[PDB]
Symmetry: D3
Subunit: 128 residues, 6 copies
């Protein structure tokens, strides 16, 4: 699969809303470092965080076990299949689109995420 | 959580349909062995197959890795959270309600399943 | 289970001895942050460190594999069941009550620990 | 470590009691197959079942996850360190000396077990 | 990757030698069941046994942990990357081309194996 | 096994070449801290990084999953058997002798490594 990704700090510095602004289009016209914006090839069954790390991208994580929110990302297009986790609520998964990249792989041919979503205020209570 | 379970072979011997017949009510009036019908306490985060095995229930499995259909169950009420798996399609998960018990835990306080769902014909192609 | 916990740095700043002082009673009259003193609900089979992290508590760890002492805690009441580990001696487990929280779950309904026990001098040689 | 082992079916066929009879001495004068009596070299940290399997010994197991009793053994001398497990009670571990070989390694230089202890009647309720 | 595979029992029934006979060409002119001869798509990082099982192929395995020889295959073209294992010798890996399919993934775009190689006499001592 | 190890920063500060200089002999005449030069006993099947950490050596790592280069070491004598990994090329493994210590164990009775090899320029692109 292809996961296009945008570091949440770029969304936050610009005052963008990940559903009203053309976050991926506008970050492609900037000159962000590759770990902050780009597209990543990720096999089905391959963890997104580990595909990012194998490109040398030091995306956030702490536990690597679905027991924190440090690796959270928001999926804007496509889907990410996760291992079992009890930290995110059903509403955070189904409506807020929070996925944990340490334990999630692409579930669609094309996925688009805003990673580093640990800075979202509702997730700050599970960030270690 | 409590997972009430019914072995699919009882549904199949009786010609029941798991959505039109009172499968759990009618199996409670029979005298099935406890591994074939009952309710199981399963912790959040605890695999349903392993909670069944720790009661001495030898529910079906082969791979234990989300790479076959031998541990499939159909969830009729509540939900089961699974580890990442590529063997079941989105339609099998979202519409047919197939969950793999070797890698799935209860995702709700009350869950009801028809286990041993590996005998369903559409899953016979992934049964090893 | 319920694990009541006290960060070892509070015991050490106060010159308390974890077996002569009323360490939990006295920390309950202070105004410590919740990660430093409180009670945690932890399922049987659930790692104590991961239950702490899912509350947003950034308790110490490095390896997460029972190969260091950074996640050590001293269990004062109840018990913690650990995965296999060769780093702690029998005397450290049976007499000094050292448990590794990254690989240990509650083994009793009520457990009381002094976590962050990596600062104990006899464990400083295995702290990374 | 060295784990000397005796298949429980030899103890049971002979009417021996694993604490009054010279079970290892008497099985050494028989002509059992090597998987039924012998001594096994097992590294610290190496699972006893997997050291037996790498000698081609097909010792019993089902789940390999500490969720059944099929791999049980009784440790008569030395000790076996296990991963976390909730299936055995404290009394079964501390007084009856039940260890699960799929998730246990030697915890002493010399260990002696009676494997295939799944045939003990008090464990028959967790045998799958 | 593509792994073309041939069940070793076909090689053995025909008196073929996996290095002098056109084992894959000749099995393609037979009418073997798909689990006995075919080509399998296997992701890098995906275990060959689990890719076979997800096609419903019940290829041999016992331990799934690199502690037996039941899942052995001989790689004739390309390579399979394995997890750490101590059961096979260097000569069995480098010269006899034995790979354990439960813990090995394709290491080349095109791989060709003769699976079910547990029937080879030199591996019979580690078959459980 | 015995793994003799030398921190790559000592090789780099001295302008040594790990194949022309007597890197281990010359570091033995210095007064490096034990984590920077010494010999480590590591069981077959035991990860080298975890054997180092259990001596209190805080050797580099990030992912612990074979998805980065932070734990790289160069093996100068003997060999290290690794779990499956897709981050290193065949040439990096076979010719440059790069091994990932988080997922590698000794594959020979005597092994000699230059750890902390993440500072090598060709590996800097996979260092997180
Ligand atoms: S790093 Fe904690 S859940 Fe992903
Ligand atoms: S036993 Fe194969 S997926 Fe559960
Ligand atoms: S963090 Fe190292 S043993 Fe727990
Ligand atoms: S085989 Fe089930 S606990 Fe060991
Ligand atoms: S099934 Fe035992 S090593 Fe693969
Ligand atoms: S720490 Fe990343 S591969 Fe070893
Ligand atoms: K694509
Ligand atoms: K802002
Ligand atoms: K750009
Ligand atoms: K993220
Ligand atoms: K969940
Ligand atoms: K949504
Ligand atoms: K309930
Ligand atoms: K029928
Ligand atoms: K009944
Ligand atoms: K089932
Ligand atoms: K999926
Ligand atoms: K549905
Ligand atoms: K309680
Ligand atoms: K002090
Ligand atoms: K207080
Ligand atoms: K701790
Ligand atoms: K131990
Ligand atoms: K004690
Ligand atoms: K010995
Ligand atoms: K008898
Ligand atoms: K004999
Ligand atoms: K046993
Ligand atoms: K226990
Ligand atoms: K005892
Ligand atoms: K191909
Ligand atoms: K033949
Ligand atoms: K054919
Ligand atoms: K095979
Ligand atoms: K090896
Ligand atoms: K060869
Ligand atoms: K040696
Ligand atoms: K230099
Ligand atoms: K010295
Ligand atoms: K290293
Ligand atoms: K590789
Ligand atoms: K070389």
């Amino acid at each position: 699969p292809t996961v296009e990704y945008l570091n949440y700090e770029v969304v936050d510095d610009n005052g963008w809303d990940m559903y009203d602004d053309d976050v991926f289009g506008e970050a492609s016209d900037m000159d962000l470092d590759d770990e902050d914006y780009g597209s990543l090839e990720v096999n089905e069954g391959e963890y997104i965080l580990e595909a990012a790390e194998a490109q040398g991208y030091d995306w956030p994580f702490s536990c690597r076990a679905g027991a924190c929110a440090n690796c959270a990302a928001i999926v804007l297009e496509g889907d990410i299949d996760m291992d079992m986790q009890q930290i995110l609520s059903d509403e955070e998964v189904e409506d807020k689109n929070v996925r944990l990249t340490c334990i999630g792989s692409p579930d669609a041919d094309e996925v688009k995420i805003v990673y580093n979503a640990k800075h979202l205020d509702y997730l700050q209570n599970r960030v270690i």
